[PDB]
Each structure stands twice: as C-alpha cells, then as structure tokens.
Scaffold this active site. Structure first.
Site, PDB file in Angstrom:
ATOM      1  N   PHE A 177      91.273  35.684  -9.039  1.00 19.79           N
ATOM      2  CA  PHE A 177      89.917  36.007  -8.652  1.00 19.79           C
ATOM      3  C   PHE A 177      89.647  37.589  -8.541  1.00 19.79           C
ATOM      4  CE2 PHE A 177      85.751  34.933  -7.504  1.00 19.79           C
ATOM      5  CZ  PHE A 177      85.364  36.081  -6.766  1.00 19.79           C
TER       6      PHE A 177
ATOM      7  N   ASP B 147      94.948  44.393  -8.076  1.00 16.39           N
ATOM      8  CA  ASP B 147      93.758  44.146  -7.112  1.00 16.39           C
ATOM      9  C   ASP B 147      94.194  43.732  -5.756  1.00 16.39           C
ATOM     10  OD1 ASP B 147      90.936  42.085  -7.787  1.00 16.39           O
ATOM     11  OD2 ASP B 147      91.358  43.156  -6.110  1.00 16.39           O
TER      12      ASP B 147
ATOM     13  N   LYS C 233      86.439  45.349   0.493  1.00 19.28           N
ATOM     14  CA  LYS C 233      86.350  44.299   1.631  1.00 19.28           C
ATOM     15  C   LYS C 233      86.664  45.193   2.954  1.00 19.28           C
ATOM     16  CE  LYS C 233      86.533  39.991  -0.671  1.00 19.28           C
ATOM     17  NZ  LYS C 233      87.102  39.286  -1.823  1.00 19.28           N
TER      18      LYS C 233
ATOM     19  N   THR D 230      75.113  55.103  -9.823  1.00 13.53           N
ATOM     20  CA  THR D 230      74.234  55.998  -9.060  1.00 13.53           C
ATOM     21  C   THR D 230      75.042  56.518  -7.690  1.00 13.53           C
ATOM     22  OG1 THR D 230      72.397  54.813  -9.848  1.00 13.53           O
ATOM     23  CG2 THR D 230      71.982  56.177  -7.681  1.00 13.53           C
TER      24      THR D 230
HETATM   25  C1  LIG Z   1      70.255  53.365 -12.397  1.00  5.69           C
HETATM   26  C2  LIG Z   1      70.044  52.253 -12.874  1.00  5.69           C
HETATM   27  C3  LIG Z   1      70.498  51.003 -13.128  1.00  5.69           C
HETATM   28  C4  LIG Z   1      71.991  50.983 -12.551  1.00  5.69           C
HETATM   29  O1  LIG Z   1      71.888  51.176 -10.968  1.00  5.69           O
HETATM   30  P1  LIG Z   1      73.438  51.670 -10.327  1.00  5.69           P
HETATM   31  O2  LIG Z   1      72.855  51.498  -8.920  1.00  5.69           O
HETATM   32  O3  LIG Z   1      73.694  53.001 -10.900  1.00  5.69           O
HETATM   33  O4  LIG Z   1      74.181  50.664 -10.722  1.00  5.69           O
HETATM   34  C5  LIG Z   1      70.286  50.059 -13.963  1.00  5.69           C
HETATM   35  N1  LIG Z   1      69.184  50.131 -14.561  1.00  5.69           N
HETATM   36  C6  LIG Z   1      68.292  51.075 -14.466  1.00  5.69           C
HETATM   37  C7  LIG Z   1      66.814  51.140 -15.293  1.00  5.69           C
HETATM   38  C8  LIG Z   1      68.654  52.350 -13.888  1.00  5.69           C
HETATM   39  O5  LIG Z   1      68.011  53.503 -13.664  1.00  5.69           O
HETATM   40  C1  LIG Z   2      86.503  39.397  -3.025  1.00  3.41           C
HETATM   41  C2  LIG Z   2      87.383  40.278  -4.124  1.00  3.41           C
HETATM   42  C3  LIG Z   2      86.925  40.744  -5.403  1.00  3.41           C
HETATM   43  C4  LIG Z   2      85.525  41.173  -5.535  1.00  3.41           C
HETATM   44  O1  LIG Z   2      84.881  42.067  -4.439  1.00  3.41           O
HETATM   45  P1  LIG Z   2      83.362  41.881  -4.173  1.00  3.41           P
HETATM   46  O2  LIG Z   2      82.832  43.042  -3.180  1.00  3.41           O
HETATM   47  O3  LIG Z   2      82.900  40.472  -3.613  1.00  3.41           O
HETATM   48  O4  LIG Z   2      82.713  42.150  -5.545  1.00  3.41           O
HETATM   49  C5  LIG Z   2      87.756  41.206  -6.225  1.00  3.41           C
HETATM   50  N1  LIG Z   2      89.202  40.826  -6.176  1.00  3.41           N
HETATM   51  C6  LIG Z   2      89.673  40.045  -5.202  1.00  3.41           C
HETATM   52  C7  LIG Z   2      91.163  39.801  -5.250  1.00  3.41           C
HETATM   53  C8  LIG Z   2      88.694  39.563  -4.163  1.00  3.41           C
HETATM   54  O5  LIG Z   2      89.182  38.815  -3.141  1.00  3.41           O
END
Ligand SMILES: *Cc1c(COP(=O)(O)O)cnc(C)c1O
Ligand SMILES: *Cc1c(COP(=O)(O)O)cnc(C)c1O
Ligand code: FES
Lengths: 461, 461
Positions: free
Chosen positions: A179, A288, A319, A343
């Site tokens: 995961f 990970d 986490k 962003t």
């Molecule tokens: C900035 C933006 C995103 C991505 O947002 P993030 O918070 O950077 O991941 C997606 N779509 C549009 C139109 C954006 O301006």
């Molecule tokens: C929970 C988890 C993620 C993803 O984290 P999110 O913040 O929920 O996107 C990725 N890798 C492992 C092993 C995780 O347990």
C-alpha cells in the site's frame, strides 16, 4: 498527560455519533466512519467520542498521531503569539518560503535524515510524497540515460501530448500486499485490497510477491529463508522481463513492513538483498516509511534495523511526521526547478509542530520506549496465542508495530467491535488481521491494560 | 488592516534572502525560490521579505491567499483557546471526524456549493482533488456500464494486478495549455509547459485544443466564434476516436480560465456547449476551479458566469479555499467506502479558517469588490496597452483574474524582475504572459498604485 484508563458509557457508535453519521451521510458516503470524536477532551493514549466514551486508542488515526492527543507541548506552541502567522499565512513553499524555513527543517526532518541522503523535499501527504518520489526517480533514470546533455526537440514536443519518448514507458516495481496511496500513480503500486483498486485505470508495471512468512519463526527457519529467496529471485526476473518489454524498471518501492495489506514482515536480510538487487539493475530503491516511520518499530525509521550505510536512494514519509516528504541521495536531485513542485509542498505549521514532536521523542526516549512497550505487548499476544489458538495465530511485530491473524474476516471484525465497546480501539488490516498502531506515549502499563481487557474478551468469546 | 503602500530597501532578492537561499540550496534545488519572507510582518495586500522590503503582492502565493496576510479575523481564531485542539489533533477524517465536522462544513464549503451538486468530499490539495475526481468519475462510468450487476470475479482478480477488466483502459479528456496538478494522474491532463511533463510516464488520453481568442475581442467576433467552434468539434471527434480505440472517455476536465498555461480565456458560450458535448457522450464534466475558485472573477466560482442550472458533474477546488476537495452530483457518490479515501482528507484547521474567510468575503462584499477592482485594473492595463503596443498585447481578464502578453520570455521575466524591485510582486504564466492574482482585499487604489509604478517602469524600459 494521560488518563488512568478507559471509561465506557454507551456502545460505539453511540446515539450522538449515529446522529452525526446520519447528517454526514447526506453529503458523502459515510460508511467508513467509526464514530465522531471529542478531540478537545481526548488526551494522550485516550480518544474521547461525542457520547462521552473514552477509549484506549491503539489505532492512532491510522498510525498518524505521534505523541498522543492534546499533548501539552503542542498546546503551548499554538498558544505562543509568535506562532500565529505560521497558522494563518500559508506560503507557496516552492517560491516564497518563510525566514525560518531552513532552521525549522534543521530542528525537525534534517535531524532525523536517513543515512546517505542529504536531500529533502517536503509534501503535504503520503501519496504526493510517493508520486513525486516516482517522478524524481523517472527523471533520474532519464538523466542517467541522457547524461549531461540537453532535452531533445522530439522529447520536448512529445512530452506535451503524453507520448514517448518525451513521456517514457518506464515502470516502478511494487509488491503484492503493498500500500503506497491511492492517487493514480501510487495506486498502480498498491496491491492491498480489491475494493481499493477496482474500476481505476492502472499502469502495466511489474508486481512481485512479498514474502509470506510462516510462524512461529523458529519452527520455519529454512522455509522462511526459501520463501524470501524465491521472492527475491522473482523480483529480479521481473526486472529483466520488463527491461525486455521496453518498460524499464526505473525504481523499486517497498514498505519495510507491509501495513494495509496485512502487516507482512520480512527479515532484514531480505531487505538488504532486495536493496542489492535494486543497485545491481540500476533501479532506484524507494523505501516507503509513511506508516513505519516515526519510531514505533523502536528505531526512528524502520529501515535502520537493516543496519545499512546505504539503505535506499529515496525514502518517503508522512502520517506521524505531521507533514509529508522524502529524503533522497544528492544524485536524485532534480536538475531544474518546476519539475518536482506544487503549490504548498507541505505546510510550515506542520513543521512547527513536528520540531516539537521530535524534541519530545528524543528527550523522553520514546524510541527505546516503543521497543520496550512493544516487547511487553508482543509477549502478552504470544501468551494469548498459546491460550486461544482457535482465535489467534501468526502473532508478530517489531516494536509496537504488532499484529495477529484471526480465522476469518467475520471474527476479525467482531473482535474489533467487541474491543471497542470494551474501551479499546483496534485496527484491522488485510482480510483477517488485527493490527496495533499505538502512539509513542503508549507505555508498558498501557500494554498490560490492553492485554487484560482482551484476555477477558477471549475468555468470554 | 493594510499598509499604505510599498517600501523598498534593497534589490530582491536581498542579501538576507540570498544567504537563506544558499542554505536551502544545500538540501534541495532552490532555483525556483524568489525570496524568503517575513510573514509575521506581512499584512493585507503586502508581503514583507527578510531584507525589510515590503511589496504589493499581486501574485498571492500563486493565487492561494484569500483575504490577505495576517488577517485580524484569522488571528482571532488562532487566539481562541477553544480552537487549540483543532490545530494539534489531526484526525483521519474518513473514519473519526470531529463533532463539529458537519457544522463547520455547513458554515464553509456547503454554503457555497455549486448548482446541482449535493455531495462534497474534502482533500488536502488541488492535485488529490483532481486525482480523486478522476477516480470518482471512472467508478461512476463503470457503474453505468455494469448497472445492477455486481463486480465480476474477473474484475476483482485483475484489478489487484493492474489489469483489465478490473483496471479499465478509460481516459479523461484534457486540453492543451491545461494545468491540473503534477501527480501522475493529474499530470496526464496537464499540458502547461514541457519542463513540467518531461521524463514522466503518462497516459494515452485525448488532448483537445483550447480556444485561442484574438484580441481585441470586438475586432474578432467571427474569428473567435469560429476558433471556439473548431475546438468544440475537435473535442467531439476525440471522444468518438477514443471510443473506437476502446479507451473510452469517461470524463472531461477543463479550467474555466487556463492559468499556468497562459491565462487563456473562452466565452461562456464555449463552456455551455462543451458541457452539452460532455452530457451528449455520457462523459462526466469535471470543472477545475482550483485557481479560478474563491471569488477573484467576481463570482465565487468562475463557472457561475456561464449561468447554468447544471454547470458540471464534478468541481474541484483548493488554494484560496484553504482546503481542497470536490463537489459532485448525487449520482457520482461512490457506492462503497474505501474507494475515495486517504488518511487525512483535508484538515479541520483549514475548515476552521475557511469558515471565517467565507464570512469575510460575504460581509465585506468581496465578490463585487473583485469585479470592481478588477475593472479598474483592466481599464488601466488597456490604457497601458494603447500607450506601449511594443511591450503589451492581448490585455485580458475577468474580475482581477487579468493578464497580458509581452513580446518574448526574456522581456516578460525582465518586467517581472523590475516590477518586484519597484515594490510589486507579479506572476508570469505561459511563455510570455504576465498575470495578476491579487487577494480578495485588493481594492481599486491598489490597482492605481500598481498602474502608476508599472507605467514608470514601461516609460524608461
Ligand atoms: C494549482 C492548481 C492545481 C494543483 O493544485 P496543488 O495544490 O498545487 O496540488 C490543479 N488545477 C489548477 C487549475 C491549479 O491552478
Ligand atoms: C497511509 C500510507 C500512504 C499514503 O498516505 P496518505 O497521506 O493517506 O496519502 C502511503 N504509504 C503507506 C505505507 C501508507 O501507510
Ligand atoms: S496529493 Fe498530497 S496533499 Fe494532495
């Protein structure tokens, strides 16, 4: 600051929770909701719900609450007038970082940098950490292939319209039971449960078997050695096989302990050899630690148990660490800006909190405590296994990162449900495993508390 | 609370910023960094850097700061003892929401729900919003196809190993010039700049041309009508073509105004027709308001300008909104839990802040103000265009969401650089456009302030 024990007033979810669950269910699917919480009254290892129930929380928001609820040191940070701006003025970190950005990183993430990794990029969650780690790896592989040369005209053109060679057909190798998140990139490397994956377009990337160990460990030394060797061999064959399909494996991603898929362990020897295979084939080794990271295995990062000077090329986290991100080797540094970018790239408010969390982890010796409390927990689980082989099997763990299997899904869910009504929040993983993810302020007296209640539960079961 | 104007002490970046930039560059690629900031001293429309420079900020952290820096109403929230828990106890929202979760949503996001969309799921950023919107759409599309039938055995099996039919080969149609985020799913729908896409594996998904309007608008009525019709026709042909390839278009994503790719506008008529095409072919219509959303166009959501009762099936947001997420039609509601999911699914602290932001937008009538201030801004830009046709062209905007072109990239960057040293933070987009993303407390007098400065810059450029 903790409570003295659990105190139940109602079954869970209780009436107030069921009311709020109904309301929420208007606006979204709320079937996953366990119950609604009173975080204001939750303290340390204890989660308080809206019905006044106070449970010993060994799930900790899916292993994301590092030093318990309403930790007084964190309370103090929020109370400091100097810290107001950090909470209300969120910067686009990639372009306009706050004055204290580097220093706050020095007091937090940099102070726990894994071996051989001088680089750090922050992210808001586990999924964008893995997604951007994938991209970092793909960029590194092409950079390795193109050398210190310019982008070709063809590449610049094709990449805009989703075509090779601009957009290479490279892969990341992942393991069954893995995961890594659920955004479409991560999701391709996730192999946890069918409901997580179904109906979503994926990537034709190699999927290797993760070792399924047989317990007890001391009765299956040879069998477990062979299982691990078999898996390692299959990884290598997949790398070769995908090189031939021109779907070159640019990196390998693995959890030091597989979580959502069923708390699957492997030996340190297995991971050392896997890392060697990664290097042998020029694959980036991506570890990970989103769930294993933060100390519950008795070391800050679970991979430290492997004892390597060069444990990985890239390591993601989130986490427990409040913020996401990934450490990596200098050689994986992007060559140009605006390739690894978004962003917010995390949030300084989380770094502010994290610095204090790490200070607590160090000053209160919480890594050693996790090993000790985890030992007490595991011993008790082993005793319960011996007493109730009809319900408990494959008791396993490292630090407080423990688990066991039950005979089937139905029993698993029932035991979790009973435990919850009895004052203990437990987590499940895989089809029929119960898992433990206590916060780092979980002590041996908490383990004994839990073992007592679960003991009576099993006798009554 | 605002300052009276800009005040420069040094070149930007200044010595302290250059020092901090050097430090940060050890740990990560820091070439994107403009300068380091003193958010504590930043107020309203003015960003203060570490060298004591105080700039009129018309970029607003890439359009993500809704009501200016250090807004006193937000200060007060952080100062309230009752709100401490919200900042230090971060819940896994999918399973254990806080008591006030629904009510806080009612005072924030639900109070600005787009027409025809009763559902809402929260997310931490724009990218996971679009990624999970994609998944929501793919799930919806397969649910139509299978109808009342359960998941097939084959589907359940193959989805775990990244294979059809479990993992369908469905596509999302996107537009050239688009920007929807950089995680691997979003990235496939992004077509902003080559450096953003190159070396990253992508999806073979249809890419349609976004209209390129010729300016001034009143001299090119027919030409612009025909350009839009051409684009609409090409969208439809792509949908048809990808059905025949068995890469069925499940949804269409578009920005109401293309941002990162160069502030490209299209008529409201164009979007109404595009929406009709989406419906005609059973494609989910996904509107990405991550950058246009939050009121700068003069309406809370830019798509409101289209005047439709049924503007979209799904709408994503983030940036100004503090949290991310997406509204959607009841029919797009996931059928089961743990399909659209992640650990945090946003952050209650952001919802806390957002509720107050929305309250301010309403009491201070900031939507109408954006329209008015934006009108003053645009009028001044038109006048500068008339006076400096050798530097300025294609002046355009809606509300304060304005921009213009310069002759080439080098000039663009130079003008931004000069403006910054003169007290004005400007943003660029596309190859040669300068863009404006003022916060919602940007008033007509700030527009004049900027216009007088920029006018002097152009005079001796
Ligand atoms: C900035 C933006 C995103 C991505 O947002 P993030 O918070 O950077 O991941 C997606 N779509 C549009 C139109 C954006 O301006
Ligand atoms: C929970 C988890 C993620 C993803 O984290 P999110 O913040 O929920 O996107 C990725 N890798 C492992 C092993 C995780 O347990
Ligand atoms: S994908 Fe990580 S915060 Fe959105």
């Amino acid at each position: 600051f903790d409570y003295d024990g659990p105190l139940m007033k109602t079954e869970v979810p209780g009436p107030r929770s069921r009311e709020l669950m109904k309301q929420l269910n208007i606006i979204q699917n709320a079937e996953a909701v366990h119950f609604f919480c009173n975080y204001e009254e939750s303290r340390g290892n204890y989660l308080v719900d809206v019905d006044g129930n106070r449970m010993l929380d060994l799930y900790s928001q899916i292993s994301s609450i590092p030093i318990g609820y309403s930790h007084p040191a964190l309370v103090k940070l929020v109370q400091q007038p100097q810290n107001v701006s950090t909470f209300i003025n969120r910067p686009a970190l990639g372009i306009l970082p706050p004055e204290n950005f580097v220093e706050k990183l020095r007091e937090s993430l940099l102070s726990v940098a894994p071996k051989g990794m001088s680089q750090l990029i922050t992210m808001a969650c586990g999924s964008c950490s893995n997604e951007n780690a994938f991209k970092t790896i793909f960029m590194w592989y092409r950079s390795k292939e193109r050398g210190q040369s310019a982008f070709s005209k063809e590449e610049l053109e094709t990449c805009m319209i989703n075509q090779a060679p601009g957009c290479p057909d490279y892969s990341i190798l992942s393991f069954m039971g893995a995961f890594h998140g659920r955004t479409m990139g991560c999701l391709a490397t996730t192999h946890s449960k069918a409901i997580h994956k179904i109906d979503i377009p994926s990537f034709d990337w190699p999927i290797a078997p993760f070792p399924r160990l047989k317990y007890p460990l001391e009765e299956f030394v040879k069998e477990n050695q062979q299982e691990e060797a078999r898996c390692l061999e299959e990884v290598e064959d997949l790398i070769v096989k995908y090189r031939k399909k021109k779907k070159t494996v640019a990196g390998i991603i693995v959890e030091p302990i597989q979580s959502e898929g069923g708390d699957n362990h492997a030996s340190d020897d297995f991971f050392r050899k896997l890392r060697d295979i990664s290097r042998k084939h020029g694959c980036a080794f991506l570890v990970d630690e989103v769930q294993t990271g933060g100390g519950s295995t008795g070391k800050f990062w679970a991979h430290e148990h492997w004892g390597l000077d060069d444990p990985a090329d890239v390591m993601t986290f989130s986490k427990k660490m409040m913020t996401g991100g990934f450490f990596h080797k200098e050689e994986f540094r992007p060559n140009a800006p605006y390739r690894i970018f978004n962003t917010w790239l995390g949030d300084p408010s989380k770094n502010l909190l994290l610095a204090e969390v790490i200070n607590i982890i160090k000053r209160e010796d919480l890594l050693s405590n996790a090993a000790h409390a985890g030992k007490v927990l595991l011993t008790g689980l082993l005793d319960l296994q011996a007493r109730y082989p009809q319900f408990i099997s494959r008791v396993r763990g490292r630090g407080t990162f423990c688990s066991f299997d039950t005979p089937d899904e139905s029993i698993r869910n029932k035991l979790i449900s009973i435990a919850r009504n009895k004052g203990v929040m437990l987590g499940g993983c895989g089809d029929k495993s119960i898992r433990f993810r206590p916060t780092l302020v979980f002590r041996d007296h908490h383990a004994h508390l839990f073992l007592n209640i679960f003991s009576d539960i099993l006798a009554d079961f």
